[PDB]
Design a protein around this nucleic acid. Sequence first.
RNA 1: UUGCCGUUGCAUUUUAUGGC
Lengths: 121, 437, 50, 174, 65
Amino acid sequence: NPKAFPLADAALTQQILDVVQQAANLRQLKKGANEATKTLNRGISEFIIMAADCEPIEILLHLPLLCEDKNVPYVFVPSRVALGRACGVSRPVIAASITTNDASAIKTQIYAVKDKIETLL
Amino acid sequence: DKDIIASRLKEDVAEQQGRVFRYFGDKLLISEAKQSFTRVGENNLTCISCFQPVLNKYTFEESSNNKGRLFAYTVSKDLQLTKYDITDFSKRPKKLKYAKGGAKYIPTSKHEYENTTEGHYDEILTVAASPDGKYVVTGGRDRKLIVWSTESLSPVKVIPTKDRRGEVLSLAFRKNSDQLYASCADFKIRTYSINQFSQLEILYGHHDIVEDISALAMERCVTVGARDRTAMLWKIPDETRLTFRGGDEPQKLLRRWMKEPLFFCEGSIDVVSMVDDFHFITGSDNGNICLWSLAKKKPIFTERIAHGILPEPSFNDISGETDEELRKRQLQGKKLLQPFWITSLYAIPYSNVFISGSWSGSLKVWKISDNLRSFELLGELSGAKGVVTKIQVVESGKHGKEKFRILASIAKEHRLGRWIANVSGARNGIYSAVIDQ
Amino acid sequence: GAEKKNKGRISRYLANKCSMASRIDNYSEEPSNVFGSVLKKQVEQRLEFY
Amino acid sequence: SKTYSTPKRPYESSRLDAELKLAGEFGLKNKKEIYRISFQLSKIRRAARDLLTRDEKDPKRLFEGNALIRRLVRVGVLSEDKKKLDYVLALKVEDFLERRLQTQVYKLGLAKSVHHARVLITQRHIAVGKQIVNIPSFMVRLDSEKHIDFAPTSPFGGARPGRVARRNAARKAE
Amino acid sequence: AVTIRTRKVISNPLLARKQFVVDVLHPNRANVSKDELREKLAEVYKAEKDAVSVFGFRTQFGGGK
RNA sequence: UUGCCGUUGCAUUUUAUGGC
């Protein structure tokens, strides 16, 4: 029973982070832990992703208490550098979020991802 | 007799026919080279491209220009490129001509239809050298192409990419010619001609950011985009495309193995080289390295995790706790082990062996087999600690005995982003290995 | 009052490093001092940047 | 030809508010655009009703329903999971006209409003890969949804700036 | 700078011709100026500039090819 | 063989390496 329990396996990892890159190219993503919690307690968040190998794990483990209280799915991913390459940014981002927007052309893939990870959790 | 007809066919008719002919699979002894690091005073060296004068091109009139010396060109993220003398295999490379740009080359109009300033203004990413030996192209983060003359490194012509994110990532000449193909990050592919200093064609059609690219003497060009698990062979004169996708699923591979083993899906295709005009190789993100034919959408041979798996974060810097059982259980077992990436891959053109590289330090030189459908680990060169951003091979000798020179550019940052993950003892340099026979 | 240009960017750096340390020592089960020490060294290097 | 058809009554309150909402939401010109898309929706699901009312395992129903769902997923109005024939019966006009190039480049970004999207792609700026499209009602296929960008011979891409910009550069550099 | 590119080339010694389809690609110019095209095509082949002929051009939409 | 700091070399180019 570790502290990063809903850790996604390989194929679900690849589909959630190509949805990440589509969102980053569609200007619908928030990069980083404190902007993630700011958009989370603002409310606009379809789902949030953390990285399960940051060198202190608690600096993004503070996000569960917000997200499963405000009823939004959350998923750990086994590589911060892969999530950085997904977000399309130089330094490794460890906590990304997808904002909510019904004027974005990845709504179908976002909802498929969200249904898969609610079944995962 | 047979020796004369063999040498006379292997001189030209194989190299224009297309199949692999320069077989030195077991002729090349594997691991007894003179491995030489060379320090270099830049930050985060980005790309290498060596130019060798071809001996007696296709009829005669040997090569272009000194008369018969090899060369190399390197380029860093400090906005400078350095010409290298490389030709003396007995000793180290020699810095010959520096050429550096800086913040004074910022265009003041910023209107993007002209970047006629000659230097650079950030993070040059790729140099290629012309086969005619009188031009060297370069391109990087400042949406530009620059041609320099070959021995004074003075800028001759400035070719803007003419798009707001018209962001070049890798250049590639096609051999013994003057058309080059430039990858970009606005998903297109540029085709330039050097001798006219011109842009022939903008071939679109790639879906995501097209990251790397190679070409051979036949006028076809292979490209690889990052995050859609694909590889496009552009046949230019028929203006058509061939779309090779990956698609190894871990559930089917686990079902194939469990009858008798930790692997995972493909993240990204990264680097390429064409072995011939009918096969090629892709070194992907997740450790897969794949030999593809031109006949099948599936790859022929997808070798698994290339350079091993990264060592996990230790039991004192994972969770900030005190007790060792808690800071070891937060590693979650092997479930967050991540593979070494294939950072750069390079095949000797029309041959058997190709060279990979990662930040696992070790250039693993494989060898393909004679039935052209499998490859095995020939050798491993443990000489270059650092990321291996591109690998070049320059050779010398006769028809019989060949003395090859593996050059590789070694840095402490990947050539696109920073992304330093567990790098230890890795200095900006050029890794030389004079392999023989 | 607490966390006492060049006089303000150091306070912002100290602010989000303080939030980082707060996350560590609250969501841990029982915390350590090594991350507080390397946080102190990071912010001291950011101060000696001046 | 006669694509568009007049509905069963054209002067009615609920129909009037339907055309008002759809026109002002997807940025449309007149009632003929809603009538064309509504007509071809009605035609394809009237064809789907017959394939439903005949039995299963008939070769007609099998590969003609596979043909219809292949054509509809190629246009992109049907998601990848609901690949059976009665979701074509459950289709709607909104996610059928959402795939026109106007709405699609507004969803892709790069336009800041639906009406600005329409006026720029009729001012000849957006090209699907290589082909400059100067018409809104395109119904862009699913495969070429990511090839939308400003055309290279247009000054929102990387061409020469427009005649307004260079004329103002002239008589502001004088 | 323009390029030309021929495809679908079939020999035809029933008239001793070679007939083909011609794709000219000009990135910014209007069109490829048939006389200059004809001398360029006779240069890339081995022809006369009198024994080479092109007729059925059409510039595709949006310009460029 | 380096923008800066730690090493060889022979009878001071040369000799390998690791901290930013």
